[PDB]
Amino acid sequence: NRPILFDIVSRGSTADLDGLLPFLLTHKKRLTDEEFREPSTGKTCLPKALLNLSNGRNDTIPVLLDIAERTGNMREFINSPFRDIYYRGQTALHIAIERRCKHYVELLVAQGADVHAQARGRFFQPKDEGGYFYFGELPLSLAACTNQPHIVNYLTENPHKKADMRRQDSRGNTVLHALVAIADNTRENTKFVTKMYDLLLLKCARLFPDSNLEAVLNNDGLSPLMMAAKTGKIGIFQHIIRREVTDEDTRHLSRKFKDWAYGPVYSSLYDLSSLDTCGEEASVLEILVYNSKIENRHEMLAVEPINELLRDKWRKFGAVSFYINVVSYLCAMVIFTLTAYYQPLEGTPPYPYRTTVDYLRLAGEVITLFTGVLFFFTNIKDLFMKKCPGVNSLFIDGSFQLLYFIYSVLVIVSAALYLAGIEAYLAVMVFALVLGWMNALYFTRGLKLTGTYSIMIQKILFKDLFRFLLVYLLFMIGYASALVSLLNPCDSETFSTFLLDLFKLTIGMGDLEMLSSTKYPVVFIILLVTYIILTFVLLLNMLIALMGETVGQVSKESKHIWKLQWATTILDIERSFPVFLRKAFRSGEMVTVGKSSDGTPDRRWCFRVDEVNWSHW
Amino acid sequence: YSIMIQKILFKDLFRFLLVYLLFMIGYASALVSLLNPCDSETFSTFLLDLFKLTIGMGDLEMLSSTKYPVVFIILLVTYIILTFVLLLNMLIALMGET
Amino acid sequence: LHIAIERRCKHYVELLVAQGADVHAQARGRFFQPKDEGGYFYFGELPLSLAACTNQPHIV
Ligand SMILES: CC(C)C[C@H](NC(=O)c1cc2ccccc2s1)C(=O)N1CCN(C(=O)[C@H](CO)NS(=O)(=O)c2ccc(Cl)cc2Cl)CC1
Ligand SMILES: CC(C)CCC[C@@H](C)[C@H]1CC[C@H]2[C@@H]3CC=C4C[C@@H](OC(=O)CCC(=O)O)CC[C@]4(C)[C@H]3CC[C@]12C
Ligand SMILES: CC(C)CCC[C@@H](C)[C@H]1CC[C@H]2[C@@H]3CC=C4C[C@@H](OC(=O)CCC(=O)O)CC[C@]4(C)[C@H]3CC[C@]12C
């Protein structure tokens, strides 16, 4: 009777249901029998009834519920989960909440519907994973994400059952996590997201004063603030940063306080308990800066407390140590260069050290080798410090983090050769020296006047020049192969010499003498002319077009990128300090702005700023 | 013209010349160290030859005496590529923006 | 007097002036110094100047 019952329930007719209870009683057939359930997805009568209905009044639900009650299988029937993959775990309560009908939600909850059921189907998974909609996999979270304040209010406080707001799904995300996940930067979405977030946080704090909801962390270890920062959702992030609660009862959980006003000047005291961490836990600032592929990183960096904190941190110790860094590195490079120049070609390495100059010469090599080893150790410590960032962190951006690794290798590699491979240690030592000299732009990144230059040269080099060089290499290969084939000698050495001559020509110097020996000289000259014309005239200076366009983008965003680079370098410098010293350099005050519910002082670290307003009269 | 040449000269050209001098120092020191004569006068003569090359004239004859000529040519090619191709006319980008 | 003027209350200003409050007293604290020097607000270091800079025509 599955098809007939499905048709009856879909049509919404109530008279047809008459006589079903006697049939079930006589045949002792439960409403959850496999035959009744749809084989495709284990769907039952109730979800079909709730899916299709007229103005939210299908009118068949109470009769079916009474029938199930008479059969004595109400608990199993109401909360029967869907099987299969796409809609696994879905229940009747989720559907009732989705269709925005309060009456059916009340009915299901009163009759005993489970309120903690989790929907884990692939359709409910995040967008990037394959599911078109994600809401935290909970009824209350689903209601909150769909902008239904009345449903959330009723479900939180019900005489039958209550859905605790501090409940985590399989992913670990709680209601706030899901609300942030679906948050969008659109004008309309942000307003309701913030309103629901504030309402839910206030309710949770009111009901449970001891525990703060935002404290809970997901499996990834992030909090709603940290997750919003990582996902690039500025709309909720900025609101969370400057959250202020006027209510006296629950004003403790506020993040922005008022210090004092003198005339147009207003000084306010922000809180940064978790915004800045001295290695104790992950900080919003590090996640915002180091992480890649963030939609609105530049905008999120330009917030009231972030800029002031960066400025104060830079003034306190950043400038003092940055110049020390530059001086030490330049001195080491000068020592390395002097060691490289005064290298005795005569004799088999290693050499005996007996003379006065040996005292000075050996020290340079020892210092350079120890510096390379120190660089390698620093670069492995840093890699493990950031929890082993993947390829995207190293290769695509922060190229200097990789280059010093290469410099770390060669410098020590040569040493091995210097002990056994005496003959050819110079070949790689000189290349290491060149790379070390060339990779000093990391220290120039910080300077405001020349901060952009290094970033934009690194950007253009790998992206524009290589893309152009693909086509240039196509041309080079074709023309060089053609010219090599054409010439008549009357072979590897001849080909190499011809390639050398052609490269010398390509620079713009040399002489055109090859045509004399070859046959068909006229076509040879025609081909050379086409080569020169195409490459030099068009490509050589048409690359400059998009190169200048790239520099134009960098010029348009020069101020924004410099701020990012300066923040990166100062944070970099900070992170290498020991934990105890970092704690000794803590920034902010210990103002006891307010007392807890029991009266104990909060005594939380904060940071005060000030601004000027003239319209506040 | 006068105001903008005075402005660009001290601000753009010097900022670019810092990086250019880093490259120059590194490459020149490397090449001087690499060559085997068998010293101040030799270094000065090599620097003169390398500058004459940097302009775009002169001849590449130094490789004959030195050992490991292939790496020497590779390094010279990297020098020429980087400086001339990228920097020499990428300075022009921000110069034109100024 | 400076505080009374700042809080925009005319009554207390009248009371202090009538009772004999000094009207030429100068405030020279670092907080009152110019912005670039270290003081967040500068108004000439006088009561009348403070009232004028705060847009209080009646007090002036
Ligand atoms: C000691 C503190 C007061 C400051 C600290 N400087 C140093 O420890 C040393 C400098 C020098 C100079 C000559 C010889 C020996 C040393 S030891 C400092 O401020 N930093 C080092 C850690 N940093 C890094 O490791 C970046 C970011 O992770 N990676 S890197 O590109 O590979 C790099 C950059 C510069 C230096 Cl140099 C070493 C490295 Cl692997 C950042 C910046
Ligand atoms: C335009 C650019 C970006 C692409 C070309 C890459 C260069 C690095 C190539 C172009 C021509 C090449 C040269 C062509 C011929 C030779 C000679 C070869 O050794 C010889 O002198 C041959 C004599 C012999 O072996 O008997 C060593 C490499 C070198 C300099 C090659 C090294 C690499 C060069 C400079
Ligand atoms: C790219 C630019 C902006 C930076 C380089 C600065 C130039 C002014 C340097 C580059 C090479 C230098 C030259 C390298 C070698 C010499 C030879 C030296 O005297 C000699 O002829 C050496 C012979 C001897 O003393 O026995 C006088 C300076 C000169 C021309 C140097 C003078 C200054 C030069 C041209």
Q: Separation of A503 CA from ligand 2 center, angstroms? A: 8
d(CA A100, CA A146): 9
Q: Which residues pair with A589 in a beta bridge?
A: A606
Q: Where are the alpha helices (DSSP H) in A52-174?
A: 61-71, 74-78, 92-98, 102-111, 139-145, 149-156
d(CA A127, CA A490): 68
What's the order of all strands across the beta sheet hosting A256-262? A256-262, A265-271, A606-612
Answer yes or no: is C56 a known binding residue. yes
Written as six digits, the tokens of A469 are: 């060089």
The whole-angstrom distance between A609's CA and the closest CA on chain C is 11
**Which residue out of A339, A343, A345 would a mutagenesis test of the B interface target, given it has the greatest number of B Cβ atoms within 10 Å?**
A345
d(CA A267, CA A373): 49
- Beta-carbon contacts of A565 under 8 Å, excluding residues fewer than 6 positions away, are A445, A446, A451, A452, A455
d(CA A591, CA A258): 12
d(CA A85, CA A597): 47
Answer yes or no: is A83 a known binding residue. no
d(CA A301, CA A296): 9
Q: Separation of A223 CA from ligand 3 center, angstroms? A: 62
* Residues, chain B: 98
Nearest in space to A288 (alpha carbons), one of A219, A354, A238, A213: A238
Dihedral in degrees, nearest 10, Cα atoms A219, A222, A225, A230: -110
d(CA A486, CA A610): 77
d(CA A340, CA A317): 35
Written as six digits, the tokens of A437 are: 């000299």
DSSP three-state, residue A594: coil
User: Experimental technique used?
Assistant: cryo-EM
Written as six digits, the tokens of A99 are: 């269709």
Neighbour-count burial for A199-215, b at 16+ CB within 10 Å, e otherwise = ebbbbbbeeeeeeebbe
Written as six digits, the tokens of A23 are: 């049939």
| Spatial contact of A594 and A606, defined as CB atoms under 8 Å apart | no
The H or E element containing residue A270 is strand A265-271
DSSP three-state, residue A611: strand
Nearest in space to B31 (alpha carbons), one of A437, A422, A309: A437
Neighbour-count burial for C17-44, b at 16+ CB within 10 Å, e otherwise = eeeeeeeeeeeeeeebbeeeeeebbebe
The bound ligand whose nearest atom lies closest to the alpha carbon of A381 is 1
Contacts of residues A573-577 at CB distance under 8 Å and 24 or more positions apart, as own/partner, are A573/A318, A573/A321, A573/A322, A573/A325, A574/A313, A574/A317, A574/A318, A575/A286, A575/A382, A575/A385, A576/A378, A576/A382
CB–CB contact A509 B87 (8 Å): no
Rg (CA), chain B: 16
Among positive and negative, which fits the CA dihedral A23, A29, A31, A33? negative
**Helix, strand, coil share (%) of chain A residues, nearest 5:** 60, 5, 35
Distance of CA A400 to the CA centre of its chain: 20
d(CA A45, CA C14): 82
- Beta-carbon contacts of B97 under 8 Å, excluding residues fewer than 6 positions away, are A551, A552, A555
DSSP three-state, residue A159: coil
The whole-angstrom distance between C22's CA and the closest CA on chain A is 21
Nearest in space to A588 (alpha carbons), one of A332, A320, A274, A282: A274
d(CA A111, CA A73): 12
In this structure, which amino acid lies at residue A11?
R
Give the DSSP letter of residue A589. Answer: B
Distances (CA, A) of A473 to A5, A261, A470, A545: 72, 67, 5, 19
The whole-angstrom distance between A289's CA and the closest CA on chain B is 26
The H or E element containing residue A137 is none
Written as six digits, the tokens of A247 are: 């209510």
The whole-angstrom distance between A613's CA and the closest CA on chain C is 12
Q: Where are the alpha helices (DSSP H) in A420-509?
A: 425-438, 441-444, 451-460, 466-486, 492-507
Nearest in space to A107 (alpha carbons), one of A147, A67, A68, A61: A61
| Spatial contact of A255 and A607, defined as CB atoms under 8 Å apart | no
Among positive and negative, which fits the CA dihedral A597, A598, A603, A609? positive
CB–CB contact A264 C41 (8 Å): yes
Burial of A170 (0-12, 13-18, 19+ CB in 10 A): exposed
A374 C-beta closer than 6 A to ligand 1: yes
DSSP three-state, residue A256: strand
Nearest CA in chain B to A500: B73
Give the DSSP letter of residue A15. Answer: G
* Backbone angles phi and psi of B82, in degrees to 5: -50, -65
Q: Where are the alpha helices (DSSP H) in A208-354?
A: 224-231, 234-241, 284-290, 297-301, 304-313, 319-341
The H or E element containing residue A261 is strand A256-262
For residue B60, which residues of chain A lie inside 8 Å, CB to CB?
A: 504
For residue C41, which residues of chain A lie inside 8 Å, CB to CB?
A: 262-265
For residue C53, which residues of chain A lie inside 8 Å, CB to CB?
A: 263
Burial of A23 (0-12, 13-18, 19+ CB in 10 A): exposed
In this structure, which amino acid lies at residue A38?
E
d(CA A88, CA A121): 4
Atom 22 in ligand 1: residue holding the nearest Cα: A576
* Backbone angles phi and psi of B65, in degrees to 5: -75, -35
Written as six digits, the tokens of A53 are: 């209905």
Nearest in space to A193 (alpha carbons), one of A211, A209, A215, A175: A175
H, E, C per residue of A416-437: HHHHCCCCCHHHHHHHHHHHHH
| Spatial contact of A314 and A574, defined as CB atoms under 8 Å apart | no
Which residue precedes each gap in chain A (C to N above 2.5 Å)? 490
Written as six digits, the tokens of A292 are: 């890649």
- Beta-carbon contacts of A349 under 8 Å, excluding residues fewer than 6 positions away, are A418, A419, A422, A423, A425
Looking up tokens 């002082």 gives A601
- Which residues of C, range 1-60, sit inside 8 Å of A by Cβ? 6, 31, 40-41, 43, 53-55
A321 C-beta closer than 6 A to ligand 1: yes
Answer yes or no: is A252 a known binding residue. no
B39 C-beta closer than 6 A to ligand 3: no
| Spatial contact of A271 and A212, defined as CB atoms under 8 Å apart | no
Interchain contact A599–B (C-beta under 8 A): no
Q: Which residues pair with A354 in a beta bridge?
A: none
Give, for ligand 3, the residue of B16, B21, B25, B47 to mutate: max count of ligand atoms closer than 8 Å to Cβ.
B47
Nearest in space to A271 (alpha carbons), one of A288, A246, A285, A254: A254
Written as six digits, the tokens of B84 are: 């001339």
- From the CA of A404, give the closest atom in ligand 1: 32
In this structure, which amino acid lies at residue A27?
H
- Beta-carbon contacts of A408 under 8 Å, excluding residues fewer than 6 positions away, are A372, A373, A375, A376, A379
Report DSSP letters for chain B, one per residue.
-HHHHHHHIIIIIHHHHHHHHHHHHHHHHHHHHH-----HHHHHHHHHHHHHHHHT-S---GGGTSSSHHHHHHHHHHHHIIIIIIIIHHHHHHHHH-
Give the DSSP letter of residue A214. Answer: G
**Inter-helix orientation angle B14-34/A425-438, to 10°:** 170
Q: Separation of A504 CA from ligand 3 center, angstroms? A: 24
| Spatial contact of A368 and A432, defined as CB atoms under 8 Å apart | no
Nearest in space to A218 (alpha carbons), one of A181, A184, A253, A170: A170
Nearest in space to A217 (alpha carbons), one of A277, A281, A270: A281
Nearest CB to B30; choose among A434, A450, A461: A434
Written as six digits, the tokens of A361 are: 């010469």
| Spatial contact of A181 and A218, defined as CB atoms under 8 Å apart | no
DSSP three-state, residue A595: strand
Nearest CB to A610; choose among C6, C40, C43: C40
Which residue precedes each gap in chain B (C to N above 2.5 Å)? 38
